[PDB]
RNA sequence: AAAA
RNA sequence: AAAA
């Protein structure tokens, strides 16, 4: 699929001009139609500062004000149906009002909005126009885009293109070129940051330090995370470090993560105080880095949900998951470890032995030394450490064992072992 | 070490105002003086456009014009003179002149300038102002900065803050708060690009086919790089895939890399046509990604040169190299692979034995089943595959061999083994792109 | 997406040989593993005669028995898990049982199974091995394939390869070459056949002619088609005759067709009577031409479902639909008819005129007494006949009307006119 | 006119059994005699494989060997002798002989043979028995039979029946029913392939690269075709796109097509080497797609030759040509386009005017805006584009012009216009394939 | 500093 | 007539 994203400031103040792009031309106030004409995008996203709001009756008339005029202006140069408009929280003192809050709220808001727009199935061709963007909103939208596409690139080929028109000078300008300023094949970057201390999800901007602790206490999300924090970090680490069995057993609940974000998003919006008489907007809650981590964590889950196979987790299903999830030397380490356990399984099968609920140490044949679950041996052996993994071969009549053993040999962690891996992997994500 | 980077438009056009930042308060036309009082940087870096220039009798009269205008403005404001100015090649048609060329030239030019300014030793605390910038110079300066910092973070701690000012309103503005819009523990990202085809170092923006063919053909770079592509790619992959022995053996000649980058940067600069009468700059060559890859490659080599040593490579030295370069599960598999070779060394030492120039397979005592060198085995075993490595224990009277064999056990690739690995790692680096 | 279709008789009776294919070499009793080696198919299909079945307890133990034996034969040569298996209704009097019914049942059964396997999105590379096939099963599978790929080819590029190994002769054969006997780029062939009379969907093979009229009466499919027979034929004609507006207005309800085909495929299979003691299957119903026409009709709907827009239908969309749907002179007729109406809308626009709900004849400016709607003018003017079409120009403040007019000028058929066009097109489909 | 085609393998290995067909019952080894009793065909065709041959002293001894065996088997059984035996080039190593060559040859040889047996005048009811056939000869014969009947269906009604018998089981079988596995109205499909590049008429299977190029260079066909290629594609386009004027002015020389096919056939055959001692056949040449395209191009010419007439072409003639060749919405546009010019010729006639050698643009009443000949306007207006057609009104005393103007208004392409159309239609056929 |  |  093809996606086009553009950073806009104040669109009603631009001038009619002609643009050249991809051996084609167009005449109007915006770059959008000629971009839409060449790229033929399957979807188009517009990111504005909500700073343009004229009527402050309250938050919903502001987001209505802006959307109305974007919809009017989008008719005025035929920008089509297939459009989303991300009306972001910008700040400062202006002609027709005043907005206040954390400057980083836009990053987290644009990140949350794009995480709900960017296709999670299939390949991506992303197009970005920095022409007409506010300097800080363009830079935050650029970062937010690249952060999620980095996570998409794990499962899919992602090519990114960015455009900036030649500078418009109102006196000399005949025609402005749409230059390609960047064209890159996005590199796979799985989420590599742990969930933070419970301060960093929502922070107070200008809300009294006693009122905050009241509302933080009241939230469901934060207390449900206190529980799940370690298992989520265990899953994040599973992609980072090449732990295919931990990836499956720790797969997060997408609908529950959806809930956490919704509650934090509407909580952040429910602390936006609008004074109609001072034409003043104060966003009393600031988004925290942990809101960013959760958005990315959920996005990463959607991208990889296709791999969550039915139990029991066989050697064959684990090869299959690994081939998609891992690259470079990590993939090759995982193929070797599964190789050992498979090659042994094939030995057992030719002797008519089908061990059920047998320790991986006893399955591979280990002398009773060490038996301590080291960070070293968990991370070094694709999380398939011998003191934490139960093995079972569903008994069957073999004709081609070198083929079958992959299907009939299943791995799961022991309940004790899983808590040791969870602790080890969580801890490794924090020394990062 | 703190570094302050500011992205700057047409500075002579900015209005006087007040700035709030870090409990401090400032009056001026620019954010630079207050950022320097608060952040107290060890070096300031101003990045801005060619397109400010107004004298067109040459390129060196266009740059010395802009440099002198910046210096004169730095005095007008309470700004220091511990500053590097990067005059980036911009594009468009202006009232005072015309600049034509590749848009992407700015990125590669700034990437080149920053690569020689950003410290290669010690930790970095990088501060970036995007208040005054041209959206397209700012984005490219941002992109360029982060790309190098990601390489800097392989060896050192790199934290990154960006700042942008409240938007200025011609006569609604009393004071602008300089807001913090980003703070980042920069993650390690070793170079993951292979070196590209020989079309992609310089390209003709506006040059006759035949004339460009003569230039391309005259470059010592595209000649030396044709034979040396494989070895440089093998080294790139050594960091990426966790191969500490290959890291040392393939360690690039920094001199030869400087030569290549200088030559290409000269050729590009020398092809800048400035027409005095009609006031129009044409950059007849454009920088390719090949140039970008080399700038980063050299930077990665500069960043990691503190680890290189002479040809005897001890399992102890491999352990120490490995803990600097590698992280997560890459480091731990390396430690395990070095563990099983060190342990075998300790078994040999107690028996009073010290083999020399012995295939690692015969040292570990493998079957004769498989001698074919697979990508699987090379990458899976931190590049220390039994069929390509030659072990040499240097005889010593043992007494605590558990803590000693490390220093006296030396690893090396056989000449045949090194070519087999070079091909595997180079092909591996091109299939993961 | 690559696709391998192999036609099999009695796999248990083939002898172990070696095969040469694409410089590669392989040993064993079937062409299938070397075929999957060289072609690397994304999916594989196996078409068998169910006349190899042995256990006659009921229908679902024959397909079970057959499926198990196939699944074991694959397990024994290495064919992987990426395999659908079409067990097709054959006939004849065999060693281990007897099978009676319509021989053409095999055609429609395979057509129906292939219509739910062949991708209905993107290009196709199709590989067909005719080596080990029953003679009439291979000839019917080959036809059902080409007939569907012909419809797939309307929207996407479809290359077709056919292979046959050198004849096996059990005494002298060292190695058999796998010869390519056909290599074709499938030409686009829209459904060109009308829906028949209500006799020709299911027919009695061995059902007394009174018990039949009983079941035909109860089928919902036949009672619904009676209404929609003309709407569906109007649509079939729309692709055949180059009528872009009628393609959108008459686009079939896909869920509604899906259900018609399932009622007829479970009715046909409801009337398969096994006699476990006599070991004699009798398929008391036989699929008719009407079933086949519905399968091709549904497949063509799927292949082209991506073009369906939301009303109203602009000139711009009718250009877009047409570029995808139509080729040769038929496209250029459509582009000229949309050209005239667009150029008229430009003239109206430049004068600040924007007529709504106006007859096309009045919009274009026609003399009277030519209100008779003829098959000639409907087909000759891409279904955009002056007395059956209404034009609406949505009012906009023009700037470059040569660009704008395309988006703001919308066409629909009047409710009177649509019926005239439906009648005309349906009739034109029957004279074919 | 009825036609019975049957795919046979080795007919001397068939058992005896009972056959049910058309109410009747028959005893013997072949389904053929009962197929002839019931269907009562005008002509019968037997397609069988080369591989049945046993005498290897020559290639005509091998075909005279095979034919004899067939004729004698047509006596053992109560069959007719009013028959055609297409002896197709088979492939495989057998107990009695070894045959080598392209497997695809048999399609082209059968397509060729059928092109000269299928009647090219009046309707066709075609019957095909796949009971006794080799799986690959049956598919190729079916494909080749459909390919030809599709071109035949342009001009006449073509219904197709295909039969196959209940599977024969050694000792379980008593009576085998002959099942109708297909009954079709063969849809009209005019040739829609352009003539290919000159790689793809004859290719070397087992011919030394040199020996082939001497042969290829000795061929008249390739030389004559390179120069007639475009005008043949123009004609192929005329039927496909509905251009009735172009169809007449580009109607091929059937004699030169007959010529091209025989030279290629006799070359393909004259390069079959047959070694008598080691009983080996090698067809060192292989037929290409281009040979197939010519066999169909000629067949289409034969099928549509009924319509051609001398150089003056009238609007009445163009109506009747169009009525026979074209269908659906293509026919109706041709009628509407011929309707315009005719309706205008009647306005001219009532005034007593009869223009000669006048451009269609000046005849209809056009501006000077666009004289440029577009693919769009050529294909959309049935090839009767305004800047390439010249109308001549043959002066007559009108008395009911609305019935007469048809016979007395003639259309011709201008020398410059015809080349502009040939180019357009030729290239249009190449983009659509 | 909401196309330097 | 279940790789003539």
DSSP for D259-307? HHHHHHHHHHHHTEEEETTTTEEEE-EEE-HHHHHHHHHHHHHHHTGGG
- Look at residues C21, C56, C297 and name the one whose alpha carbon lies nearest to residue C180: C21
CA-based angle C102:C107:C112, to the nearest 5? 120
Identify how the structure was determined: X-ray
Would you call D140 and C182 a contact, using CB atoms and an 8 Å cutoff? yes
> Using the beta-carbon criterion (under 8 Å), do C75 and A399 form an inter-chain contact?
yes
- What is the C-alpha separation between C81 and D92, in angstroms, rounded? 33
CB proximity A369 to B under 8 Å: no
Does a cis peptide bond (omega within 30 degrees of 0) precede residue C146? Answer: no
Q: Do A399 and C76 touch (CB under 8 A)?
A: yes
Binary contact (B180, A240; C-beta < 8 A)? no
Query: Helix (H, G, I), strand (E, B), or coil: what is residue B182?
Result: strand
User: CB distance from A174 to chain C under 8 Å?
Assistant: no
Separation between the CA of B179 and the C1’ of E2 (whole angstroms): 16
The answer to whether A132 CB is within 7 Å of strand E is yes
Question: Which phi and psi (to 5°) does residue B208 adopt?
Answer: -60, 135
Residues in a beta bridge with C47: C7, C86
DSSP structure string for C308-373: PPPSSEEHHHHHHHHHHH--HHHHHHHHHHHHHHHHHHHHHHHTT----SEEHHHHHT--SS----
User: CA C87 → CA A400, B179, C92, C163, distances in Å?
Assistant: 26, 70, 16, 21
**CA nearest neighbour of B329 among D284, D263, C257, A241:** A241
The tokens describing C2, both together, are 């690559």
| Pair B201, B291: CB distance under 8 Å | yes
Q: Which of D87, D8, D5, D6 is nearest to D53 (CA)?
A: D87
Residues in chain A: 432
State whether the beta carbon of B65 lies below 7 angstroms from any atom of strand E: no
List of C residues 28-87 with CB within 7 A of strand F: 29, 31, 49, 51-52
Phi, psi at C252, each rounded to 5°: -70, 145
D contacts of C169 (beta carbons < 8 Å): 92-95
Q: How many beta-carbon pairs under 8 angstroms link A with B?
A: 161
DSSP D321-332: HHHHH--HHHHH
What's the burial of D82, exposed, middle or buried (CB within 10 Å: 0-12/13-18/19+)? exposed
Q: Do the Cβ atoms of C332 and D380 come within 8 Å?
A: yes
Contact call for residues D344 and D401 (beta carbons, < 8 A): no
CB contact under 8 A, A135 and B133: yes
Q: Does B182 touch chain A (CB under 8 A)?
A: yes
B136 interaction partners in chain A (CB closer than 8 Å): 130, 164, 179, 181
**What is the secondary structure of D357-388 as a DSSP string?**
SEEHHHHHT--SS-----HHHHHHTTT--TTT
Distances (CA, A) of D124 to D4, D86, D149, D153, D158: 11, 20, 9, 9, 5
- DSSP labels, D211-247: HHHHHHHH-HHHHHHHHHHHHHHHHHHHHHHT-HHHH
Per-residue flag: A15 CB under 7 A of strand E? yes
Q: Which nucleotides of E are covered by protein (CB under 7 A)?
A: 1-4
* Secondary structure (3-state) at D127: strand
Q: Which two tokens stand for residue B108?
A: 């590669």
Q: What is the SS3 assignment for C399? A: coil
Which of C399, C406, C409 should be substituted to probe chain A, the one whose Cβ sees the most A Cβ atoms within 10 Å? C399
Residues of A in contact with C313 (CB under 8 A): none
- Distance, in Å, from the CA atom of B370 to the CA atom of B353, rounded to the nearest integer, reads 26
Cα–Cα distance measured from residue B51 to residue B103, given in angstroms and rounded to the nearest whole number: 12
A87 burial via Cβ count (<10 Å: 0-12, 13-18, 19+): buried
- Secondary structure (3-state) at A44: strand
CA–CA separation, B268 and B285 (whole Å): 6
- C52's CB contacts (< 8 A; 6+ apart) are C9, C10, C12, C66, C69
Q: At what angle do helices A105-115 and A289-304 cross, to 10 degrees?
A: 10
Nearest C-alpha neighbor of A146 from the set B142, B148, C360: B142
Answer whether A179 touches B (CB < 8 Å).
yes
C1'-nearest nucleotide to the CA of C134: F2
Q: Does A403 touch chain C (CB under 8 A)?
A: yes
What are the tokens at C252? Answer: 């079939």
Q: Indicate if CB(D52) is under 7 A from strand F.
A: yes
How far apart CA C145 and CA C90 sit, in angstroms, is 18
User: Would you call D379 and C329 a contact, using CB atoms and an 8 Å cutoff?
Assistant: yes
**Phi and psi of A78, rounded to 5°?**
50, 75
End-to-end CA distance of chain D: 33
User: Which residue of A78, A81, A403 is in closest CB contact with C78?
Assistant: A403
* Beta-bridge partners for C7: C47
Tell me the C-alpha distance between D145 and D139, whole Å.
Answer: 10
Q: For an interface test with D, give the residue of C135, C168, C386, C425 to mutate (most D CBs within 10 A).
A: C135
Do residue A181 and residue B332 have CB atoms under 8 angstroms apart? no
Token representation of residue B37 = 């009082």
Instruction: For residues C391 and C10, give the distance between their C-alpha atoms in angstroms, rounded to a whole number.
Output: 63
| Distance (Å) of CA B365 to CA A12, B348, B359, B386, C393 | 77, 12, 9, 10, 85
Distance from CA of A152 to the nearest CA of C (A): 22
Q: What's the token pair of residue D246? A: 């172009």
* DSSP characters over C136-154: HHHHHHHHHHHHHHHHHTT
Out of C103, C130, C187, closest to residue D139 by CB: C130
Quote the CA–CA distance of C134 and C142 in Å, as a whole number: 12
Q: Are B205 and B283 in contact (CB under 8 A)?
A: yes
Is the CA virtual torsion B262, B268, B269, B270 positive or negative? positive
**Interchain pair C172, D93: CB under 8 A:** yes
Spatial distance between the Cα atoms of D174 and D186, rounded to a whole number of angstroms? 35
Would the CB atoms of D135 and C164 count as touching at under 8 Å? yes
Contacts of residue B103, defined as CB under 8 A and 6 or more positions apart, other chains included, come to: A164, A179, A180, A181, B91, B136
> Residues near B112 by Cβ (< 8 Å), separated by ≥ 6?
B261, B265, B291, B295
Distance from CA of D136 to the nearest CA of C (A): 6
Please tell me whether any atom of strand F lies within 7 Å of the Cβ of C9.
yes
d(CA C224, CA C227): 6
Contact B142 A140 (CB under 8 A): no
Q: Which residues of A touch C308 (CB under 8 A)?
A: none
Shortest CA gap D179–chain C (Å): 6
User: Cα–Cα distance between B59 and B68 in angstroms, integer?
Assistant: 14
Q: Phi and psi (nearest 5°) for D114? A: -70, -35
Contact A78 C400 (CB under 8 A): no
Q: Quick check: A90 CB within 7 A of strand E?
A: yes
Looking at the complex, report in whole angstroms how far the Cα of residue A352 sits from the nearest Cα belonging to chain B: 26
Q: What is the DSSP string of C233-257?
A: HHHHHHHHHT-HHHHHHT---HHHH
CA distances from C95 to B27, C92, C249 (A): 103, 10, 55
Dihedral over alpha carbons A113, A118, A119, A123 (to 10 degrees): -170
Q: Which of B246, B39, C379, A105 is nearest to D326 (CA)?
A: C379
Topology of the domain covering A2-185: Rossmann fold (3.40.50)
Q: How far apart are CA D280 and CA A25, in angstroms?
A: 68
Question: Do residues C361 and C386 lie in contact, with contact meaning Cβ atoms separated by under 8 Å?
Answer: yes
Distance of CA D327 to CAs A402, B372, C187, C375, D348, Å? 62, 67, 18, 13, 31
Q: Does C97 touch chain D (CB under 8 A)?
A: no
Which structure tokens are listed for D60? 């005509």
Tokens of B344: 């075998």
| C-alpha closest to that of B292 among B102, B45, B66, B64 | B102
Is the CA virtual torsion B259, B260, B265, B271 positive or negative? positive
Residues of B in contact with A192 (CB under 8 A): 187
Touching status, chains C and B (3+ beta-carbon pairs under 8 Å): no
Chain B environment of A90 (Cβ under 8 Å): 167
**Chain B contacts in chain A segment 253-312 (CB below 8 A):** none
φ and ψ at B198, to 5 degrees? -85, 5
CA atoms within 13 A on the CB side of D12: 8
Which residues from the 88-117 window of protein chain C have CB within 7 angstroms of nucleic acid chain F?
90, 94-96
CA distances from B195 to B141, B191, B230 (A): 22, 11, 9
Distances (CA, A) of B123 to A412, A428, B117: 42, 22, 14
Using CA atoms, how far apart are residues D188 and D190, in angstroms rounded to an integer?
7
List the structure tokens of C431. 């004279």
Q: Does B367 touch chain A (CB under 8 A)?
A: no
- How far from the centroid of its chain's Cα atoms is residue C267's Cα? 21
Name the residue among C248, C247, C239, C203 with its Cα closest to residue C222. C203
* Chain C residues inside the 8 Å CB shell of A403: 75, 78
Cβ-count burial B325-349 (b if 16+ within 10 Å, e if not): bbbbbbbbbbbbbbeebbebbbebb
Q: Under an 8 A CB cutoff, do D139 and C143 touch?
A: no
Report the alpha-carbon angle C159-C162-C166, nearest 5: 155
CB-closest option in D142, D329, D376 to C241: D329
Quote the CA–CA distance of B433 and B291 in Å, as a whole number.
18
Three-state secondary structure string covering C101-133: CCCCHHHHHHHHHHCCCCCCCCCEEEEEECCCC
d(CA A136, CA A82): 26
Give the torsion sign (CA, A7, A13, A16, A18): negative
Give the number of other Cβ atoms within 10 Å of residue A427's Cβ. 14
Contact between residue D362 and residue D391 where contact means Cβ atoms under 8 Å apart: no
**Quick one: CA dihedral A213, A214, A215, A216, positive or negative?**
positive
Cβ-Cβ contacts under 8 Å between A and C: the total is 14
Residues 171-190 of D with CB under 7 A from strand F: 176
Residues β-bridged to residue C92: C99
Domain residue limits, chain C: 2-185, 202-307, 313-430
- Out of A136, A173, A335, the one facing B130 most closely (by C-beta) is A136
Q: Chain B contact for A185, CB < 8 A?
A: yes
């Amino acid at each position: 699929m093809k996606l086009l994203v553009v950073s806009w400031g104040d669109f009603e103040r631009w001038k009619e001009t002609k643009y050249r792009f991809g051996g084609e031309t167009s005449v109007g106030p915006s770059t959008l139609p000629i971009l839409q004409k060449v790229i033929k995008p399957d979807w188009t996203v517009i990111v504005l500062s909500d700073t343009i709001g004229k009527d402050f009756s309250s938050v919903e008339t502001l987001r209505e004000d802006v959307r109305n005029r974007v919809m009017d202006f989008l008719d005025r140069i035929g920008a089509g149906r297939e459009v989303d408009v991300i009306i972001a929280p910008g700040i400062g003192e202006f002609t027709h009002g005043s907005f206040r809050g954390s400057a980083m709220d836009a990053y987290y808001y644009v990140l949350h909005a794009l995480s709900e727009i960017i296709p999670t199935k299939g390949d991506l061709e992303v197009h970005f126009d920095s022409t007409h963007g506010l300097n800080y909103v363009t830079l935050l939208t650029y970062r937010a885009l690249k952060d999620l596409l980095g996570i998409a690139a794990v499962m899919n080929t992602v090519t990114f293109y960015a455009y900036n028109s030649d500078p418009f000078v109102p006196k000399i300008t005949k025609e402005l070129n749409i230059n390609t300023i960047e064209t890159t094949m996005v590199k796979p970057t799985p989420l590599s940051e742990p969930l933070p201390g419970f301060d960093e999800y929502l922070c107070p901007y200008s809300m009294e330090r006693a009122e905050f602790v009241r509302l933080k206490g009241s939230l469901n999300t934060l207390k449900n995370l206190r529980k799940e924090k370690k298992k989520l970090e265990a899953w994040i680490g599973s992609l980072l470090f090449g732990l295919p069995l931990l990836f499956l057993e720790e797969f997060p609940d997408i609908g529950r993560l959806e809930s956490y974000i919704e509650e934090l998003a509407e909580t952040w919006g429910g602390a936006i105080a609008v004074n109609a008489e001072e034409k003043a907007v104060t966003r009393r809650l600031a988004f925290g880095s942990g809101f960013g981590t959760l958005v990315k964590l959920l996005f990463q889950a959607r991208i990889t949900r296709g791999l969550l196979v039915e139990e029991p987790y066989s050697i064959e299903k684990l090869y299959s998951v690994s081939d998609r999830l891992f690259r470079g030397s990590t993939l090759q380490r995982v193929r070797v470890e599964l190789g050992k356990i498979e090659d042994k399984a094939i030995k057992y099968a030719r002797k008519g032995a089908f061990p059920r609920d047998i320790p991986l140490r006893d399955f591979l044949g280990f002398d009773a030394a060490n038996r301590e679950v080291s960070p070293r041996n968990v991370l070094a052996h694709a999380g398939l450490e011998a003191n934490v993994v139960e093995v079972s071969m569903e008994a069957w009549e073999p004709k081609r064992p070198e083929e079958e053993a992959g299907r009939h040999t299943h791995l799961k962690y022991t309940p004790v072992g899983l808590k040791k891996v969870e602790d080890i992997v969580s801890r490794a994500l924090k020394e990062s």
